């Protein structure tokens with residue numbers, strides 16, 4: 001029993017982080033086989049950071065301009081290329097601890113583990129979700145550029161996020177491991193605004209099922225609603241649309257608990273309309289939306 | 302910016318977990334140097350589990366009754382001893398990935414990372430606190446016995462918890478790595494009740510400082526209170542006493558934010574008396590008490 005914000009064990013990823021330095025600019029890189037992946041922002045001097053032309057900046061570089069340090073051992077760069085917003089540095093040594101891995105891009109509403117990293121040294125691990133507005137509400141300080149987000153399936157690490165910058169609201173923006181940004185952001189040191197966010201409805205329902213599995217049932221009721229009558233109220237509360245696919249994905253949880261999805265939706269409608277009234281669900285006083293149906297099944301087996 | 306429930310990177314601990322089997326009973330063990338540490342409950346058959354006499358059960362065992370599996374490799378047991386509620390199995394192979402480590406016992410109110418483990422295989426990592434009543438609000442399923450909790454300081458892993466059982470309220474009880482239980486619990490398969498819990502006041506104040514560092518200031522006020530007038534109200538709300546040592550420990554956070562501790566206490570008194578009124582602090586709608594002052598400084602550098 002119990003329900004926590006649970007990350008994947010980070011060991012397989014810790015063994016891949018290195019430090020990348022170009023000039024006096026430094027950040028974190030990801031060493032897989034004989035390639036190091038890192039934000040291309042590393043080739044910016046402090047004067048290039050506001051408005052870089054990255055093609056210009058990189059053609060002025062050679063392999064010897066890149067200092068890669070894997071803990072103690074300096075890795076010799078023997079090639080460099082740029083792929084969208086990530087730089088690829090070929091090194092003369094394959095990482096002997098390279099896990100089986102994939103580069104996957106995730107969807108808004110999906111979760112992943114973040115290994116926060118500073119000067120190539122892992123500092124902490126936490127779980128988060130990609131928000132509907134393509135930001136993440138991370139925890140990152142100066143020096144965290146290049147930290148990665150990932151999921152693990154069996155023994156395969158699916159890398160899905162590489163951290164780039166913090167927006168003025170304190171939320172975070174980055175790319176997939178092919179260098180393509182999540183959301184309408186660009187890798188310049190300029191203030192950029194996140195769009196309006198929404199609440200991930202299917203995740204809230206998944207978490208309510210987790211509560212029932214763990215014996216929190218006070219919010220349940222005998223009522224039911226239709227899909228469209230639910231979506232009419234929820235969207236007044238800045239909730240995203242609940243599709244039949246979302247209802248379908250919630251199937252297994254509905255089966256294990258014996259509570260129909262539209263029955264759970266009637267509970268959520270009342271919680272939205274009435275609040276939670278000095279009560280908690282799984283230790284929280286608000287409706288938690290950063291647990292996917294898969295996360296719930298994973299933790300509530 | 303940002304503030305999350307952040308665990309330590311788990312790699313150094315993942316490399317130490319093994320599976321221990323005695324008869325048909327199986328659980329997780331911790332392999333450090335040439336010793337495997339695990340709950341002594343493993344020597345119980347299903348019929349011994351309710352009311353074991355562990356000295357009796359163990360004298361009837363020999364080294365060949367213990368199957369230790371480090372992933373693929375079977376470790377040969379060459380000795381066994383029992384220390385309080387943990388069993389020590391000497392093996393013929395030192396763990397080549399043994400980190401620098403210590404066995405430390407933690408205090409109620411202190412936090413640690415949990416590596417949840419099943420059949421010797423790490424599954425997830427999360428952060429939690431030792432509650433004032435010496436339980437932890439973990440997330441554990443069947444097969445998690447022997448999972449460990451830890452902190453990391455520089456490169457040294459300080460092991461502080463080994464998981465044993467789940468209580469009827471769904472909270473969790475275990476021992477330090479010397480086998481001495483936290484709290485008034487015993488390793489028998491009988492229903493045991495946790496005592497009444499309290500809220501960790503110094504941690505709530507630390508988290509309010511974290512909020513101010515992250516720009517959440519709506520709960521601040523121009524008032525101040527005395528230590529004893531604060532403790533009179535807080536204890537009406539099942540909060541633990543705030544000592545001058547607690548005020549002293551909060552010193553650095555008070556200095557970095559320029560908010561005196563008893564000024565922050567006046568904010569907490571109002572939050573307790575008035576509630577939070579449809580507003581959130583660092584993404585939570587209740588007063589979070591599982592972040593220590595050190596956790597805040599760690600994450601809000």
Ligand SMILES: Cn1cnc(Cn2c(=O)nc(Nc3cc4cn(C)nc4cc3Cl)n(Cc3cc(F)c(F)cc3F)c2=O)n1
Pocket residue numbers: 024025026027039041042140141142143144145164165166186187188189190302
């Ligand atoms: C508060 N915070 C939260 N997350 C972050 C991540 N982050 C970062 O770590 N570094 C950044 N700028 C750099 C300055 C450097 C100074 N030296 C010596 N080396 C440096 C390297 C970097 Cl990468 N930034 C800002 C930033 C990074 C980008 F990749 C980008 F495209 C635009 C940006 F404005 C940053 O956000 N900090």
Ligand SMILES: Cn1cnc(Cn2c(=O)nc(Nc3cc4cn(C)nc4cc3Cl)n(Cc3cc(F)c(F)cc3F)c2=O)n1
Pocket residue numbers: 001325326327328340342343441442443444445446465466467487488489490491
């Ligand atoms: C739901 N939950 C949450 N945490 C836990 C931890 N936990 C556990 O993992 N196993 C336990 N009993 C066993 C049964 C076995 C069956 N086989 C084949 N092997 C087994 C091994 C164990 Cl250890 N228990 C119960 C329990 C474990 C103890 F160590 C103890 F002292 C008293 C107890 F009641 C358990 O709580 N489950």
